[PDB]
Amino acid sequence: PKIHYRKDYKPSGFIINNVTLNINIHDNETIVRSVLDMDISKHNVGEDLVFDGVGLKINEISINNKKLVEGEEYTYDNEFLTIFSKFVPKSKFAFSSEVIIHPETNYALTGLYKSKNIIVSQCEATGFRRITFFIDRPDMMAKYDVTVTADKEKYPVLLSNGDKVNEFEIPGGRHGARFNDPHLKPCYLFAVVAGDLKHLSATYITKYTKKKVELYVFSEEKYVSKLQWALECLKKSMAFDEDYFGLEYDLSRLNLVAVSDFNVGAMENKGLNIFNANSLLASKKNSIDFSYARILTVVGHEYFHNYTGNRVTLRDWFQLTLKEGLTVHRENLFSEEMTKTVTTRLSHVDLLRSVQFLEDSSPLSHPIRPESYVSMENFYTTTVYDKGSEVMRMYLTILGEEYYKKGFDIYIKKNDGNTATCEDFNYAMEQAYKMKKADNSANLNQYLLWFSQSGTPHVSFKYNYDAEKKQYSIHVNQYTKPDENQKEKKPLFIPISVGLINPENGKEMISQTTLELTKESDTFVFNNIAVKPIPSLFRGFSAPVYIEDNLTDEERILLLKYDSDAFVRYNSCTNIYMKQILMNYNEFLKAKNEKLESFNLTPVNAQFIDAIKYLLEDPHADAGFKSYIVSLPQDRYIINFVSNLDTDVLADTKEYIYKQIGDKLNDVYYKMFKSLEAKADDLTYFNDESHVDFDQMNMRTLRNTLLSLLSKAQYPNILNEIIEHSKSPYPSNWLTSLSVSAYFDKYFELYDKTYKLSKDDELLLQEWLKTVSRSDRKDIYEILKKLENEVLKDSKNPNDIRAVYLPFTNNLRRFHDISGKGYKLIAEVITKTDKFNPMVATQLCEPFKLWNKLDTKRQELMLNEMNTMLQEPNISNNLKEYLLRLTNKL
């Protein structure tokens, strides 16, 4: 394969200053005429001029009006257009091409493609080269003048980046629109849209300069009623960047556009943000609760890129975390502020510790700044986004608010209108650090290891209390396991937010403080500590690490009950569960392996169960937080602690633990499920798409969690509750009634009922597909066949494909069937999908990431399927790279 290395970065021998496009859309072809106003850089050594250009049909090539001819002045191999250096001018020149492309047959959804009846582009990372010739890398910044033409009846709305400067009629029922984007940009931020779109709009006045900005949100006509919440979230995003960071929008107009067929969630094209419809569109009667948080996050995120990615862009793709980690962090600040619920932070931690930690101990492990790639699209990873975001957040922890804002300002001001690197950001933070320490010899050189070193650190603790001196010490050790990226790992700069809880009264004993661990180990001593404390460690999840608290379960229960920090309470609970899961897992495993006729299981700690009940009944604990305490740790979290994991032994373990707790708490669960009803399902705001009560939504989450526990338990007469729940006007409730009905005969009637409620809204039908896919049914394989034949059919919509298959891959007992049939099913879908959409095919490989953590029969079965996929003729470079890396071949 063809490998790009970070260390090999060099500036181009060329400059592209201006790009002038005409995109002429017809039914069976799109003609793209492009003039590049180019020049020779100071790095030029008389080399050939080589453009990226993939799958393009050439009509004509010229330089300065001289026609160039294939085989004589240029060569084109379907990937690269080479202009021989003899025909490359030595000063400013104009390069003209005209090519033909075919959005209508573009099912990979990269470059220019048709989604239903909308023509749309996706250019990040390397899709601009599928539209026209370019030096398609983010340091080649240029200004763009873009004209689009199309049939007027079919494509009445024409959009590109920036100010619309002309609109005109064209003979034969066509029309055109011209755009000028005055901000220098890389080609990955180009976008065009043509469709029969409807919109909502509002005017926003900026806080500091009072500039009038026109805000437009667009969709197909059928779903214009689903646009309001996105618009409100855009307003909130703008306000937040103005209020927290002092950053105002920089164009007269910002368009957001929903399309049905999209590979990811959204894209930050300057002034023209394009979204998966599932991440822009919602209505309270036709969307599950989670859509509202999703839209808030995705709108905010793409908005925040306007500075962190757009106004300050990437020198090269290896710097990807500089925009993505930083923008995830910005959005996390925003969402925490908007929702005001601890579940926002917990959900982000839950994701990191399950999905990202699994990736970081897999053969796919990479640092947040990768050293190499074949397809850059494979490095849009939880490591780069989510571990990146935690690395970006640690600066805030280390500096505090005041100095963090100063360092961010240095960064944004210095590099505005330009490219940047991770080093530039660290340099800006280092300036704030020197100010904060009042010391110009302080530096953040060590901090750079968070960019270059892979793997999750392990942080462990020992404690000592001297009652005569009233003095308490916390001894801390850090360790990162060697891996294929570094055979020798170094200590990181690890900020450890801490408090100290008096176990006797449950109260705080110190002002919150942050320990700065910079060595392999260190001892932190506290004086005037009146009694032996229970330490509250990594408050707020203050670094992206495995925490080994060395606490007893009795200490953990006390933190769960009385600590102030939501993360530490949740983590304490998590650790109690993990101790139990490992112990019972080992017990079941020994019984299976030794073929024992009888054996013991360690019961769940009864004091822990009492502590669960106490929290559940506390009316001033967050309902969202409660739903995390009654749920066991995610399977992908648990697997990081087990080698050679037998998935059926784990499933048996989880079932035991849940049954143990339910046997004690099911009446409490039922009583809470009924007592929460009035507030949970209150219809305040049901017609208001500009206000969302996130607390109320967490109450519904908790009811629906409780109902699932009670259903699995076959609690007496719970079927009546499930039937009544199916009558709720909230989709979150009536779809939960379908999942929870899995344990009863009524499942297929609920399946039909909810199908009928879902089938006329494309996005709600996809939520119904997911609900079916993740149903706890012994007959799930037959149900998947039914969905394939009756609903999915031949769809190439990535949302449909993901909905049918991915939730199912989280069915521990069924997807991991020892026959290997679950691995064969998903492998066939991956290979199928790879023939038209390589990015989606790689997304579908997710469940294989943990292959080398499984018992050796399952490792063999997964491996067999991965190697079979790898043997497929014409496998994409995306899929081939992914699979070779995942299987220790690359």
Ligand X SMILES: CC(C)C[C@H](NC(=O)[C@@H](O)[C@H](N)Cc1ccccc1)C(=O)NO
x/- map, 323-362, Zn ion, by CB under 5 A: -x--x-----------------------------------
Q: Which two tokens stand for residue 464?
A: 């000592």
Residue 266 contact among ligand X, Mg ion, Zn ion, none, beta carbon within 5 to 8 Å by kind: ligand X
Cβ-based nearer residue to Mg ion, 99 or 757 = 99
Stated length of the chain: 890
Question: CB of 23 within 8 A of CB of 147?
Answer: yes
Residue range at the interface with ligand X (CB under 6 A); choices 91-99, 148-156, 259-267, 856-864: 259-267
User: Over 518-544, what HEC string results?
Assistant: CCCEEEEEECCCCCCCEEEECCCCCCC
Rounded CA-CA distance 623/795 in Å is 39
Asked if 136 contacts 128 with a C-beta cutoff of 8 angstroms, the reply is: yes
The DSSP output letter for 634 is P
- Quick check: 55 binds Mg ion (CB under 5 A)? yes
Question: Interaction with ligand X in 328-367: which residues (CB under 6 A)?
Answer: 328
Can you tell me the distance from the alpha carbon of 502 to that of 507, in angstroms, rounded to the nearest whole number?
5
What CA–CA distance (Å, rounded) separates 135 from 52? 6
268 is in an annotated binding site: yes
CB of 267 to ligand X, least distance (A): 5
Residues 105-124 binding ligand X (CB under 6 A) are 124
Q: Which of 87, 380, 641, 836 binds ligand X (CB under 6 A)?
A: 380
Minimum separation from the CB atom of position 277 to ligand X (A): 13
Beta strands at 30-40 and 14-25: parallel, antiparallel or unpaired = antiparallel
For residue 301, say whether it is annotated as part of any ligand binding site: yes
Identify the bridge partners of residue 464 per DSSP, sorted by sequence position.
473
Stretch that binds ligand X, among 260-268, 486-494, 495-503, 598-606 (CB under 6 A): 260-268
Candidates 238, 298, 500, 801; binder of ligand X (CB under 6 A) is 298
What is Dmax (Cα atoms) for the chain? 95
The answer to whether 597 is a known ligand-binding residue is no
Pick 276 or 361: Cβ nearer ligand X: 276
Q: Which member of 51, 134, 357, 385 binds ligand X (CB under 6 A)?
A: 385
Q: How far is the CB of 102 from ligand X (least distance, A)?
A: 22
By CB under 6 A, tell whether 305 contacts ligand X. Answer: yes
| Structure token digits, residue 75 | 């060569």
Minimum distance from CB of 265 to ligand X (Å)?
A: 3
CA 648 → CA 210, 467, 697, 854, distances in Å?
62, 49, 34, 11
Minimum gap (Å) between residue 109 Cβ and ligand X: 11
Rule CB under 5 A: is residue 107 a binding residue for Mg ion?
Answer: no
- Please tell me whether residue 652 binds ligand X under the rule CB under 6 A: no
What secondary structure letter does DSSP report for 604?
Answer: P
Instruction: Report the partner that residue 267 touches, choosing among ligand X, Zn ion, Mg ion, none (CB closer than 5 to 8 A by kind).
Output: ligand X
Provide the minimum distance between the beta carbon of 194 and Zn ion in the complex, in angstroms, as a whole number.
24
Torsion angle, alpha carbons of 56, 61, 63, 69, to 10: 130
Q: Which residue has the tokens 């307003």?
A: 235
Measure the CA–CA gap between 317 and 334, rounded to whole angstroms: 26
The stretch among 172-180, 299-307, 408-416, 741-749 that binds ligand X (CB under 6 A) is 299-307
Helix 747-758 and helix 762-773: axis angle, to 10°? 160
CB-wise, 280 or 412, nearer to ligand X? 280
**Is 60 annotated as ligand-binding?**
no
- The answer on whether 458 is annotated among ligand-binding residues is no
| Residue 721 interacting with ligand X (CB under 6 A) | no
Of 279 and 701, the one with the shorter C-beta distance to Zn ion is: 279
Q: Cα–Cα distance between 801 and 792 in angstroms, integer?
A: 7
User: Between residues 272 and 459, which has the closer beta carbon with respect to ligand X?
Assistant: 272
Q: Which does 55 bind (CB under 5 to 8 A by kind): Zn ion, ligand X, Mg ion, none?
A: Mg ion
Q: What's the Cα-to-Cα distance from 167 to each of 179, 196, 213, 225, 329, rounded to whole Å?
A: 9, 16, 20, 28, 40
- For Zn ion, which is the closer residue by CB, 390 or 721? 390
- Beta-carbon contacts of residue 657 (< 8 Å; ≥ 6 apart): 577, 580, 581, 584, 604, 632
DSSP run (H or E) holding 547: strand 546-548
Q: Assess whether 548 carries a catalytic annotation.
A: no
In the complex with Mg ion, the residue whose CB is nearer, 335 or 833, is: 833
Binding residue for ligand X, selected from 55, 265, 363, 540, defined by CB under 6 A: 265
Residues 532-591 that bind ligand X (CB under 6 A): none
Q: Does 820 bind Mg ion (CB under 5 A)?
A: no
DSSP 8-state code for residue 847: G
Q: Are 183 and 279 in contact (CB under 8 A)?
A: no
Strands 93-101 and 66-67: unpaired
CB of 593 to ligand X, least distance (A): 41
Contact 216, 202 (CB under 8 A): no
Q: Which residue has the tokens 């300069």?
A: 209
4 labeled part of a ligand binding site = no
DSSP secondary structure letter of residue 789: I
* Contacts of 171 by beta carbon, 8 Å cutoff, 6+ apart: none
User: How many CB atoms are closer than 10 A to CB 337?
Assistant: 13
* Stretch binding Zn ion (CB under 5 A), from 101-109, 316-324, 542-550, 717-725: 316-324
Stretch that binds ligand X, among 63-71, 262-270, 664-672, 687-695 (CB under 6 A): 262-270
Minimum CB distance to ligand X, residue 610 (Å): 40
User: Is 102 flagged in the annotation as binding?
Assistant: no
Among 52, 145, 261, 268, binds ligand X (CB under 6 A): 268
Annotated catalytic residue within 98, 220, 232, 302: 302
CB under 5 to 8 A by kind: which of Mg ion, ligand X, Zn ion, none does 295 bind?
Answer: none
Asked if 373 touches ligand X (CB under 6 A), the answer is no
**Angle between helix 228-245 and 320-339 (nearest 10):** 100
The single-letter DSSP state of residue 321 is: H
Residue in this structure with the two tokens 């980690």, named with its chain if needed: 325
Q: Specify the stretch interacting with ligand X by CB under 6 A; choose among 148-156, 293-301, 706-714, 812-820.
A: 293-301
Binding region for ligand X (CB under 6 A) out of 300-308, 493-501, 822-830, 855-863: 300-308
Token pair of 290 as six digits: 């989670």
DSSP for residue 858: H
Helix-strand-coil percent breakdown of the chain, rounded to 5?
A: 45, 20, 35
Residue among 797 and 831 whose Cβ is closer to Mg ion: 797
By the rule CB under 6 A, 125 interacts with ligand X: yes
- Sole binder of ligand X in the list 159, 238, 266, 680 (CB under 6 A): 266
Nearest residue to 710 (alpha-carbon basis) of 818, 630, 599, 602 = 630
Q: Provide the annotated binding site for Zn(2+).
A: 301, 305, 324
Point out the annotated binding site for a peptide. Answer: 124, 265-266, 268
* Site residues (vs ligand X, CB under 6 A): 124-125, 264-268, 297-298, 301-302, 305, 324, 328, 377, 380, 385
Contact residues for Zn ion (CB under 5 A)?
A: 324, 327
Catalytic residues: 302
Binding site residues, as ranges? 124, 265-266, 268, 301, 305, 324
